């Protein structure tokens, strides 16, 4: 270990939704062993975006769960050489999202490759119109399956106008490497958006993450 | 008053599952405020149902839900006129269910009427073929909407080889009469089966469950 | 053989639908060979009901489907016993519906069976709020699986203000007796409300339905 | 006119599978008018693919859809600027795949350029393990939409084993310019791989694709 105390981290993004191509930089740091990190984007290309940055923040850091030990670390297990991480999106609207990502480490610096397209986002809704104002606190539902880890979470994006925007996530981590799995558990989250400019062409996050067992058992 | 410390139920249930029709009845007892509930089933007609138990283990009592008081205990509230609930449950391996149930108050008893249809389950899938075990302890995701209260689980059914078959529930509280709905909260369960013959004509349950905000709030 | 040219059918459904109980009785006849019906329902019980008829309709006769000598009419086939269907409707703002059918055999005339269970319609959709006007004529695929007859259909309904409303058909048929499937094909159909009261107390119905393969075939 | 009775096309893919980076390139040509039109590829990066070429085949030409003189081509009209398009497939078995394209004509020549993201399938699937062979012939449903054009279909994969493994198409036309719109009809495509080498590096394909009303129509 390899993954110390304090780690930063580079995360680049390349995406596309209803059509309308963009490209992210960013830095990003935290406590890997504590369940918090920070992280600061700047869209590159095609900005201002004409959709919900809202979307896009879920997909800027999972190796700084802070996991019991009794929990196998499966994401923290994976390095140096590290893994990758897939998700799907549905939105209730219709919207859906596909991503692919790839987690490596160089230089003691973790290293974060995004791909993301978002397809039927309806023209008048919430993401379109950036009707959304960020995420309520959300919990995980994970387990082994096909030899890497999945998740799944019932998500809400909170609106203006009052009520939420749901949608569903299901995710995947892959080691580049065998590594042990855990069993069924659960991650809780918090993602909050701490500063941004007037048009979302940089922003500022932080989340709070956490895996654990069920209360009742 | 109306719903005291201790306080008994009955219930009914009449469903289809894949062509295959069945009655079931039961008697309940449980703490409404602690959280807790049993319940003793019988398969009454169809008996010896060709699926597995499981899947109608969860339709057999929310008013038991231990709320905090800063949360509002909308089903609660909701007697003596009492409330209706109605679920969907989409099977991974494309089983559907879908279930309407009557919730009312009888001579200081709770009364439960269930009519439950679940379809499209592959002959040679784990409901089928009874090869499930028993749920994983859960957590729902509840939310306030279109003047009624909704929810959401990822739930996962133990596999007797190994590995769990998985299960998404969309639930829907829809009280007889106008009272408080609370905000965004999530609620813990954990169902067993505590008893039951071979052939499962005579099971009994019992469940926990709470209700609470998310742990980072 | 047990099916003439010419037949009639009795029908009967109990349904839920956001909670509100009702029982529909009706009669139809048509030509079997041909691939027409006509059936004339009355509400019999939660009569005015708050919903679009047009859920309902489709749920009132394939073994009257035409099929062309060389696919095998497995509906058909499976009388005098007769068979039974299965059906999810997954509609696109959130509502479910499962149904559950009997088709038998009696007095020379077909009798038909149903139970409906509908959940999760927006209290201000089109479906509660009775804005649907007939269905769009469809293209159901069908393909022989798990020794059964599947099919599923990309519906839609058209709205009083205009565009349409969504739904997904997912159908299982299954023969009381073993009969020969047919391989992967196609059936046609467009389904009409001839006649109805004021309320949709009483209705009547017509459906053109036939089987085939595909044009490019 | 811009588009002749005969057109070529160029295409590109960038794409992902379960992690698995891959990109290819190619060159096709067809009668745009008569809804007949071929292809052929080469997997330039990610050689030799280790999944169903099968799922590929359908990203690689709308344009060449016969049309009826009394259906708006959509498609054609859009040009010389020409038209987007986006697609989710989701497969029975979990697996998820979304993609987005931008369809221009530069000096006679159509241009395609395609982004596709797949995830979620299982490793030991048809997909995953190459146990596909060729899509059965289909039938999209389309309708207006949110100021674009849209459709969906039911396809299916034929297994080597025998049986089918379904997919459900969703996708949605974008013109880069506000052309006429088209109502409700359906467009009857099917694919055939020509020619292949052992690894799938290098493919041609065909596909016969016509658009028209319903046949009770």
Same mark, same amino acid.
């Not at 960013?26 to 290309?45: A, D, M, S």
């Not at 769960?65 to 670390?73: E, L, M, N, Q, Y």
């Not at 104002?133 to 809400?156: C, F, N």
């Given at each position: 270990?390899?993954?110390?105390?304090?780690?930063?981290?580079?995360?680049?993004?390349?995406?596309?939704?209803?059509?309308?191509?963009?490209?992210? /930089? *960013?830095?990003?740091?935290? $406590?890997?062993?504590?369940?918090?990190?920070?992280?600061?984007?700047? =869209? !590159?290309?095609?900005?201002?975006?004409?959709?919900?940055?809202?979307i896009?923040?879920?997909?800027?850091?999972?190796?700084?769960?802070?996991?019991?030990?009794?929990?196998?670390?499966?994401?923290?297990?994976?390095?140096? /050489? *590290?893994?990758?991480?897939? $998700?799907?999106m549905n939105f209730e609207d219709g919207g859906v999202?596909? =991503? !692919?990502?790839?987690?490596?480490?160089?230089?003691?610096?973790?290293?974060?490759?995004?791909?993301?397209?978002?397809?039927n986002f309806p023209s008048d809704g919430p993401v379109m119109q950036?009707k959304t104002?960020?995420?309520?606190?959300?919990?995980?539902?994970?387990?082994?399956?096909?030899?890497?880890?999945?998740?799944?979470?019932?998500?809400?994006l909170?609106l203006?106008?009052?009520?939420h925007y749901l949608v569903?996530?299901?995710?995947?981590?892959?080691?580049?490497?065998?590594?042990?799995?855990?069993?069924?558990?659960?991650?809780?989250?918090?993602?909050?958006?701490?500063?941004?400019?007037?048009?979302?062409?940089?922003?500022?996050?932080?989340?709070?993450?956490?895996?654990?067992?069920?209360?009742?058992?």
């Open positions: 270990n390899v993954i110390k105390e304090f780690m930063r981290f580079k995360v680049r993004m390349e995406g596309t939704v209803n059509g309308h191509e963009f490209e992210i /930089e *960013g830095e990003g740091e935290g $406590r890997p062993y504590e369940g918090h990190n920070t992280v600061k984007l700047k =869209v !590159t290309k095609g900005g201002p975006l004409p959709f919900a940055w809202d896009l923040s879920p997909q800027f850091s999972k190796v700084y769960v802070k996991h019991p030990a009794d929990i196998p670390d499966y994401k923290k297990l994976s390095f140096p /050489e *590290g893994f990758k991480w897939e $998700r799907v999202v596909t =991503v !692919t990502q790839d987690s490596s480490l160089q230089d003691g610096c973790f290293i974060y490759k995004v791909k993301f397209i978002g397809v950036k104002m960020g995420w309520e606190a959300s919990t995980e539902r994970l387990y082994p399956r096909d030899g890497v880890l999945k998740g799944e979470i019932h998500k809400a909170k203006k106008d009052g009520g569903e996530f299901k995710s995947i981590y892959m080691a580049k490497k065998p590594v042990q799995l855990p069993g069924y558990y659960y991650v809780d989250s918090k993602l909050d958006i701490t500063s941004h400019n007037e048009d979302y062409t940089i922003v500022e996050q932080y989340e709070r993450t956490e895996g654990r067992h069920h209360l009742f058992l």
